[PDB]
């Protein structure tokens, strides 16, 4: 049962986004929470790194309250970086 890469990534972004949709206006505050849950649901090659790290960082630095949709739409294509380190 391999987790591949891309499937894991698209899962990661999708779960992060879907999670952040639940918190309206607090979106910028809960990015790490939703990333945690997303890393749990989609699994990770490195527990510390998470499903997609670069996406997480992109979201954290970009996402502002109520700015969720555009921010995510911009951040989901970004390079995830090294999944093992």
């Amino acid at each position: 049962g391999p987790a591949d890469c891309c499937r894991m990534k698209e899962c990661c972004t999708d779960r992060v986004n879907e999670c952040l949709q639940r918190y309206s206006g607090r979106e910028d505050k809960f990015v790490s929470f939703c990333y945690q849950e997303a890393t749990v649901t989609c699994g990770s090659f490195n527990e510390i790194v998470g499903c997609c790290y670069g996406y997480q960082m992109c979201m954290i630095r970009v996402v502002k309250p109520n700015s969720l949709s555009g921010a995510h739409e911009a951040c989901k294509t970004v390079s995830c970086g090294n999944p093992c380190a």
Partner: protein, 51 residues
């Protein structure tokens, strides 16, 4: 941590270890005390000389 996230407590003061997993959910103040994972064993008996 749970009480903090779900708002059953306004602050948490205790020997709470700072971890990235906890830093993601909560906010940690600068460390008020320093520590590290260490090893504890039983000290050897000094002497049992006899003749």
């Amino acid at each position: 941590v749970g009480e903090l996230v779900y708002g059953k407590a306004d602050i948490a003061i205790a020997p709470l270890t700072i971890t990235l997993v906890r830093e993601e959910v909560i906010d940690f103040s600068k460390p008020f005390m320093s520590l590290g994972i260490s090893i504890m064993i039983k000290k050897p008996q000094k002497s049992k000389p006899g003749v």
